[PDB]
């Protein structure tokens, strides 16, 4: 059991048992969050847990539509998407419900990385260390997080595929066996299919592979053939030309023994790169980039963590990677994927992922590395002891990622309540009907309602967010006007191809600027030169409260000149203490009988205090204070939650029509009403 030599074993059977254990383990772990989120009712729909990233419903939707047979005209469905396609294959191949497939797919597929980890390890005659590099790599924070049992987004193979490509590269370097020639341009293709954006990453890995062929291999044949086939796999050529051209250029090389000279290969290279060439190789709005969670920044603490779940382990891993490299050279071929992770630090939070698997092999090597110092600096160490030491070093370094997984308990994109509200919305609304909501929501809104939306997590530039921002944060009447004009003109963009929709409306209402247009959606009696084609809704859920500032900013940003119109003072927080001095999270207090706030030392007069007791019914008590102030304090007793507004947010169609349940009845109709969310419709 424990006295056997595991280090020096690199056998088929062994490698596959370690792949089995590694994989099974990486799956068991994704699978605690299910052990936890099932005892919670708010997390279920159609008798199964729901998805964990907005992004997901993009594909879900799409796939569902693929399962139907068709998606509608000009609604933005991901019918045919990589992920959609694969879900809809595995669906018609399996006895499990869409929701459960959609659910566990992430868990399955992303556990595959555990395979190239230990395989590459094994190329380096270090399998057992690979096993470790992969237990670690299949759990590390960033990776787990973007790959939970819930995460039905493109991310499940984003690191499996290039990591396969790289073991491909290396196996070519070492064994120079021809099967590699078929695999890397195949992998490189699949990756490119199943994530259009891996483009640059692939380009880069190929560049490297070439400069590297030039250094360490400027003589070997197979290699230029490979650069050329990879390069062909990169370009944009009907799948058939690729598969074909590859297979011919393969057989000729396997069965033509040796007879091909450099010049004709450099012509294959030049030619192929020509294929590449033939293929490809004023109105200002607020910026959606200082706004996306997934792309927020980091304190290098969490950088390290995210990449390896332990700063000490990060410092061990970096070193292990350095030695591994300047001990093997091929591992050098990982550099791009390292760099991407590091790009995180200035590019985004969501990039650390790229640097997990590599920095794991690194770590693995360091153990080998280290266990050398011992055996090689003369240190009699028996096998019982070496194995116990390995197992402990390992459990020790992995446990942090375990802990993180325990502590990492997401809810769902939405709760049952919200879903079912939307589903209910399906049977009331027509498939061509537009729903105005914020972009965070658009996907779910769509998967659950089959409706069309103005903006989604994909269509969410400042220019696109402007409308949904406006309808939701400006005054009721003008909001009610945007809704109409934004939906209609968004449906017109689909034929007349407006580069700037807002500008379209403007030039189509003979207004000289954009503030003259917008200060003009006020007057309830509004000319309508553009026709009514479908019914428009507006979804206003409690959840969007924490975001009201961020959402409002966009319409606050005057399309004419970048500038932010108003001041925007807003904040939602909870109570912690009372004597009558009440402390609020954000450091704001409520003092002298709900009249004034201590906002960083500054006492402030409340223009009033609103006390809302029934969101559903409209029952509140408007307390008047300092008629000559600007800051409103609200209390939602149904959510024991405090709010802090300024006049214009107090008057924004959302706070007005949701929190206070008051809405101009000749403009709207309250289609749905719940403490959790409302839905209105234009008349």
């Amino acid at each position: 059991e424990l006295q056997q030599n595991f280090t020096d074993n690199n056998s088929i059977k062994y490698t596959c048992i370690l792949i089995l254990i590694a994989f099974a383990f990486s799956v068991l772990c994704r699978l605690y969050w299910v052990a936890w989120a099932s005892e919670f009712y708010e997390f279920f729909f159609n008798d199964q847990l729901m998805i964990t990233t907005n992004d997901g419903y993009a594909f879900a939707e799409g796939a569902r539509d693929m399962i139907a047979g068709f998606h509608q005209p000009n609604d933005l469905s991901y019918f045919g998407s990589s992920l959609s396609t694969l879900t809809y294959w595995l669906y018609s191949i399996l006895p499990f419900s869409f929701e459960s497939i959609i659910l566990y797919m992430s868990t399955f597929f992303a556990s595959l990385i555990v395979v190239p980890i230990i395989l590459i390890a094994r190329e380096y005659k270090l399998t057992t260390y690979g096993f470790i590099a992969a237990l670690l790599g299949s759990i590390a924070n960033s990776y787990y997080n973007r790959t939970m049992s819930g995460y039905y987004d493109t991310d499940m193979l984003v690191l499996v595929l290039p990591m396969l490509i790289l073991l491909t590269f290396i196996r070519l370097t070492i064994n120079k066996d021809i099967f590699t020639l078929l695999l890397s341009p195949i992998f490189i293709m699949i990756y490119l299919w199943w994530y259009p954006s891996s483009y640059s990453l692939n380009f880069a890995m190929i560049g490297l592979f070439g400069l590297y062929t030039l250094v360490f291999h400027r003589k070997e044949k197979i290699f230029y053939l490979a650069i050329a086939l990879m390069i062909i796999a990169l370009s944009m050529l009907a799948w058939q030309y690729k598969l074909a051209l590859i297979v011919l250029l393969f057989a000729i090389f396997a069965f033509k023994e040796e007879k091909i000279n450099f010049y004709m290969i450099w012509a294959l290279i030049f030619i192929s790169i020509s294929i590449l060439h033939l293929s490809g190789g004023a109105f200002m709005y607020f910026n959606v980039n200082e706004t996306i969670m997934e792309v927020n920044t980091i304190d290098p603490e969490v950088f390290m963590q995210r990449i390896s779940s332990s700063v000490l382990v990060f410092i061990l891993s970096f070193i292990g990677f350095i030695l591994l490299c300047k001990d093997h050279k091929s591992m050098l071929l990982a550099l791009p994927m390292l760099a991407l992770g590091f790009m995180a630090l200035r590019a985004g939070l969501r990039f650390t992922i790229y640097a997990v698997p590599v920095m794991a092999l690194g770590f693995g090597y360091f153990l080998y590395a280290f266990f050398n110092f011992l055996e090689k600096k003369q240190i009699k160490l028996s096998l019982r002891n070496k194995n116990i030491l390995l197992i402990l070093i390992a459990f020790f370094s992995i446990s942090p990622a375990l802990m993180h997984i325990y502590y990492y308990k997401s809810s769902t994109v939405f709760t049952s309540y919200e879903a079912s509200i939307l589903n209910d919305l399906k049977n009331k609304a027509q498939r061509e009907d537009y729903v105005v909501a914020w972009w965070d929501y658009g996907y779910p809104i769509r998967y659950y309602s089959d409706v069309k939306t103005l903006i989604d997590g994909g269509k969410h530039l400042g220019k696109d967010n402007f409308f949904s921002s406006f309808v939701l944060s400006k005054e009721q009447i003008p909001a009610a006007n945007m809704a109409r004009l934004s939906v209609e003109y968004t449906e017109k963009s689909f034929k007349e191809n407006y580069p700037d929709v807002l500008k379209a409306m403007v030039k189509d209402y003979n207004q000289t600027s954009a503030k003259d247009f917008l200060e003009s959606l006020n007057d309830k009696n509004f000319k309508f030169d553009t026709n009514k084609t479908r019914d428009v809704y507006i979804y206003m859920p409690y959840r969007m409260l924490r975001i009201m500032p961020v959402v409002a900013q966009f319409a606050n940003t005057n399309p004419d000149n970048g500038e932010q119109e108003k001041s925007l003072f807003f904040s939602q927080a909870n109570a912690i203490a009372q004597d009558g001095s009440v402390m609020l999270d954000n450091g704001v207090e409520i003092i002298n009988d709900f009249r004034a706030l201590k906002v960083e030392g500054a006492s402030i007069p409340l223009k009033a205090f609103v006390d809302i007791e029934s969101i559903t019914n409209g029952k509140f008590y408007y307390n008047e204070i300092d008629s000559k102030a600007q800051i409103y304090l609200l209390f939602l007793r149904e959510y024991k939650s405090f709010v802090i507004l300024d006049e214009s947010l107090y008057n924004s169609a959302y706070i007005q029509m949701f929190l206070l349940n008051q809405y101009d009845q000749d403009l709207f109709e309250q289609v749905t009403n719940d403490t959790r969310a409302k839905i209105y419709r234009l008349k």
Partner: peptide, 8 residues
């Protein structure tokens, strides 16, 4: 954190 959502 890791989700294509708005904050904050």
């Amino acid at each position: 954190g890791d989700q294509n959502a708005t904050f904050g």
